[PDB]
Design a protein around this motif. Structure first.
Motif, mmCIF file in Angstrom:
data_model
loop_
_atom_site.group_PDB
_atom_site.id
_atom_site.type_symbol
_atom_site.label_atom_id
_atom_site.label_comp_id
_atom_site.label_asym_id
_atom_site.label_seq_id
_atom_site.Cartn_x
_atom_site.Cartn_y
_atom_site.Cartn_z
ATOM 1 N N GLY A 36 70.521 33.515 74.573
ATOM 2 C CA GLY A 36 71.440 32.535 75.173
ATOM 3 C C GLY A 36 72.221 31.778 74.115
ATOM 4 N N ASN A 37 72.393 30.479 74.319
ATOM 5 C CA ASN A 37 73.192 29.659 73.396
ATOM 6 C C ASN A 37 72.298 29.058 72.303
ATOM 7 O OD1 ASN A 37 75.756 28.499 72.677
ATOM 8 N ND2 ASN A 37 75.143 26.562 73.645
ATOM 9 N N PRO A 38 72.778 28.970 71.037
ATOM 10 C CA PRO A 38 73.968 29.512 70.391
ATOM 11 C C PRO A 38 73.588 30.741 69.568
ATOM 12 C CG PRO A 38 73.025 27.854 68.975
ATOM 13 C CD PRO A 38 72.028 28.122 70.087
ATOM 14 N N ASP A 107 66.746 30.911 77.674
ATOM 15 C CA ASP A 107 67.905 30.008 77.641
ATOM 16 C C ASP A 107 68.973 30.528 78.635
ATOM 17 O OD1 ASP A 107 70.636 29.141 76.144
ATOM 18 O OD2 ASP A 107 69.077 27.693 75.550
ATOM 19 N N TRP A 108 70.238 30.620 78.237
ATOM 20 C CA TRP A 108 71.269 31.195 79.117
ATOM 21 C C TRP A 108 71.045 32.645 79.487
ATOM 22 C CZ3 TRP A 108 74.152 28.965 82.537
ATOM 23 C CH2 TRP A 108 74.513 27.618 82.373
ATOM 24 N N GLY A 109 70.309 33.371 78.643
ATOM 25 C CA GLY A 109 69.870 34.730 78.973
ATOM 26 C C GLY A 109 69.033 34.758 80.248
ATOM 27 N N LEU A 149 73.000 13.609 73.724
ATOM 28 C CA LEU A 149 73.796 14.655 73.070
ATOM 29 C C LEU A 149 74.424 15.641 74.070
ATOM 30 C CD1 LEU A 149 74.888 15.864 70.368
ATOM 31 C CD2 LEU A 149 72.769 17.210 70.328
ATOM 32 N N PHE A 150 73.629 16.127 75.025
ATOM 33 C CA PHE A 150 74.151 17.054 76.040
ATOM 34 C C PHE A 150 75.138 16.398 76.990
ATOM 35 C CE2 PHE A 150 72.315 21.330 75.523
ATOM 36 C CZ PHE A 150 71.503 21.077 74.427
ATOM 37 N N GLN A 151 74.883 15.140 77.335
ATOM 38 C CA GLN A 151 75.882 14.369 78.047
ATOM 39 C C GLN A 151 77.194 14.266 77.247
ATOM 40 O OE1 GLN A 151 73.741 10.814 79.123
ATOM 41 N NE2 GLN A 151 72.322 11.946 80.448
ATOM 42 N N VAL A 167 78.041 21.509 65.960
ATOM 43 C CA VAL A 167 76.786 20.808 66.175
ATOM 44 C C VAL A 167 75.720 21.662 66.873
ATOM 45 C CG1 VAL A 167 75.825 18.985 67.651
ATOM 46 C CG2 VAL A 167 77.516 18.410 65.887
ATOM 47 N N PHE A 168 76.129 22.561 67.762
ATOM 48 C CA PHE A 168 75.113 23.359 68.463
ATOM 49 C C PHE A 168 74.395 24.307 67.498
ATOM 50 C CE2 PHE A 168 74.249 23.297 73.091
ATOM 51 C CZ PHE A 168 73.033 23.964 73.056
ATOM 52 N N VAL A 169 75.170 25.027 66.696
ATOM 53 C CA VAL A 169 74.621 25.898 65.666
ATOM 54 C C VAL A 169 73.879 25.141 64.551
ATOM 55 C CG1 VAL A 169 75.249 27.538 63.840
ATOM 56 C CG2 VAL A 169 76.369 27.663 66.087
ATOM 57 N N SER A 205 81.205 25.615 75.790
ATOM 58 C CA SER A 205 81.314 25.998 77.198
ATOM 59 C C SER A 205 79.943 26.139 77.862
ATOM 60 C CB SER A 205 82.136 27.277 77.351
ATOM 61 O OG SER A 205 83.489 27.026 76.993
ATOM 62 N N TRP A 206 78.948 26.623 77.112
ATOM 63 C CA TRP A 206 77.593 26.770 77.656
ATOM 64 C C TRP A 206 76.965 25.464 78.121
ATOM 65 C CZ3 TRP A 206 76.570 30.609 80.312
ATOM 66 C CH2 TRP A 206 76.579 31.943 79.875
ATOM 67 N N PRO A 207 76.873 24.428 77.240
ATOM 68 C CA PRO A 207 76.257 23.191 77.750
ATOM 69 C C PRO A 207 77.029 22.555 78.891
ATOM 70 C CG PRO A 207 77.162 22.869 75.530
ATOM 71 C CD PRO A 207 77.081 24.352 75.787
ATOM 72 N N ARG A 208 78.333 22.812 78.956
ATOM 73 C CA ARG A 208 79.153 22.319 80.059
ATOM 74 C C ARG A 208 78.875 23.033 81.380
ATOM 75 N NH1 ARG A 208 84.908 20.992 76.855
ATOM 76 N NH2 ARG A 208 84.118 19.005 76.012
ATOM 77 N N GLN A 209 78.196 24.172 81.304
ATOM 78 C CA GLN A 209 77.874 24.975 82.491
ATOM 79 C C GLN A 209 76.450 24.775 83.010
ATOM 80 O OE1 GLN A 209 79.969 28.040 84.110
ATOM 81 N NE2 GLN A 209 81.063 26.099 83.804
ATOM 82 N N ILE A 210 75.612 24.067 82.255
ATOM 83 C CA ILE A 210 74.220 23.872 82.659
ATOM 84 C C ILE A 210 74.218 23.218 84.041
ATOM 85 C CG2 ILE A 210 71.953 22.913 82.084
ATOM 86 C CD1 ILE A 210 72.955 22.597 79.191
ATOM 87 N N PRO A 211 73.470 23.803 85.004
ATOM 88 C CA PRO A 211 73.419 23.217 86.340
ATOM 89 C C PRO A 211 72.573 21.943 86.318
ATOM 90 C CG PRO A 211 71.883 25.049 86.214
ATOM 91 C CD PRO A 211 72.670 25.046 84.925
HETATM 92 CL CL LIG Z 1 73.578 25.169 76.370
#
Ligand SMILES: [Cl-]
Ligand SMILES: [Ca+2]
Ligand SMILES: [Cl-]
Length: 294
Positions: A36-38, A107-109, A149-151, A167-169, A205-211
Motif C-alpha cells: 500500500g502507501n508509500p 495497508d491500501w493493498g 498529521l493525517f488530518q 513527509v509520507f516517505v 492522494s492515498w491518505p485523502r482516500q482513507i474511509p
Molecule cells: Cl495512507
C-alpha cells in the motif's frame, strides 16, 4: 532473513496506456502480495522467499508507485482509490491468475485486495492480511499520535507536507517501523518519489482516500461492503496481528477477530511490520499456503 536486496526481477506490462511493474516468479496457483502507501513490491522482498515452491509468487507495483508509470497529467483528483482499482483490476486480469488465488495484503493493498476478493470470491483460495483497513474508520480508531498529521494531509496543508517535503516517505514510513532502516532500504523506498511535486502525488492522494468518518463516501461504501462480506465468508483467512501494532488494533481488530475460518498469529511491529518481522510473517504465510495446498 533481513536484507536490502529486492526479490526476483521486475517485469513490465502495458495497462490502459501506462507501463506497470510487477514481480512474477515460479509456477502454479498465485500467491499475490499487495503493498500500500508509500511502499511498493519491495515491501515483500524478505517475505516472498518463504513461499518458494508453493506457487506463483506475484507482487505488483500500484500505478504511480514502485517502478510503475506515473499518471500523466497528475493532479489533486488523480490516484483515487477508484483509479488505482481500475489499473490493478486490469493488471490482475492480464496476469491470468486463475481461480485459486491466495491474497496477501497490507495497508491500501488490503482495501484493494479485500474489495477484489469480494468481487471475485469464487477465485479466492485464502486471504492473509496484516495492518489492514478491516472496515470503515472513525477518528477514534486512528492512533492519537497520527490524528493531527493525517488530518493535515486531508487539508490544504497536504501539498506542502507531501509533494514539497515527502513527509509520507521520509517521516511516516520510518516512524512506523521499529528497527532502523539501512541506507539502501530507504533509497529503494524513496526512489519512486525523488522528485518534488506530482511524482509524490500517490502518497498524498492515498491518505485523502482513507474511509474515515464517512468520507470519501465511495471508499466508505466499498469498505462497508467487504467488511460485511468478510465477516460472513468461509474463505480461509490468516490474520497476522502486530505488537504493538498500529492500525489494526482496538475496534477494527475486535472486528476482524470475528471473521470466520481464521487463524491468527502475533508478530513484532508497528505498521510496516514487514520490515520488523519478515521471517515470522513469511513462515506463517507459507504454513497457511501449505495447508491450503496439500
Ligand atoms: Cl495512507
Ligand atoms: Ca523507526
Ligand atoms: Cl488448478
Amino acid at each position: 532473513s533481513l536484507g536490502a536486496k529486492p526479490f526476483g526481477e521486475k517485469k513490465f506490462i502495458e495497462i490502459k496506456g501506462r507501463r506497470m511493474a510487477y514481480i512474477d516468479e515460479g509456477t502454479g496457483d498465485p500467491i499475490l502480495f499487495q503493498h500500500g502507501n508509500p511502499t511498493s513490491s519491495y515491501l515483500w522482498r524478505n517475505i516472498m522467499p518463504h513461499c518458494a515452491g508453493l506457487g506463483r509468487l506475484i507482487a505488483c507495483d500500484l500505478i504511480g508507485m514502485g517502478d510503475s508509470d506515473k499518471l500523466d497529467p497528475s493532479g489533486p483528483e488523480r490516484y483515487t482509490y477508484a483509479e488505482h482499482r481500475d489499473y490493478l483490476d486490469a493488471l490482475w486480469e492480464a496476469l491470468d491468475l486463475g481461480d485459486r488465488v491466495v491474497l496477501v495484503v497490507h495497508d491500501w493493498g488490503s482495501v484493494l485486495g479485500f474489495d477484489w476478493a469480494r468481487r471475485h470470491r469464487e477465485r479466492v483460495q485464502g486471504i492473509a492480511y496484516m495492518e489492514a483497513i478491516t472496515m470503515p474508520l472513525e477518528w477514534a480508531d486512528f492512533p492519537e499520535q497520527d490524528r493531527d498529521l493525517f488530518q493535515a494531509f486531508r487539508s490544504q496543508a497536504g501539498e506542502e507536507l507531501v509533494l514539497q517535503d515527502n513527509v509520507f516517505v521520509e517521516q511516516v514510513l520510518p516512524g512506523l517501523i521499529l528497527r532502523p532502516l539501512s541506507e539502501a532500504e530507504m533509497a529503494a523506498y524513496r526512489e519512486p518519489f525523488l522528485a518534488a511535486g506530482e511524482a509524490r502525488r500517490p502518497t498524498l492522494s492515498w491518505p485523502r482516500q482513507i474511509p474515515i468518518a464517512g468520507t470519501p463516501a465511495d471508499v466508505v461504501a466499498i469498505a462497508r461492503d467487504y467488511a460485511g462480506w468478510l465477516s460472513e465468508s468461509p474463505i480461509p483467512k490468516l490474520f497476522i496481528n502486530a505488537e504493538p501494532g498500529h492500525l489494526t488494533t482496538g475496534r477494527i481488530r475486535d472486528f476482524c477477530r470475528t471473521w470466520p475460518n481464521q487463524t491468527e498469529i502475533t508478530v513484532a511491529g508497528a505498521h510496516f511490520i514487514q520490515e520488523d518481522s519478515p521471517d515470522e510473517i513469511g513462515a506463517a504465510i507459507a504454513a497457511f499456503v501449505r495447508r491450503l495446498r496439500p
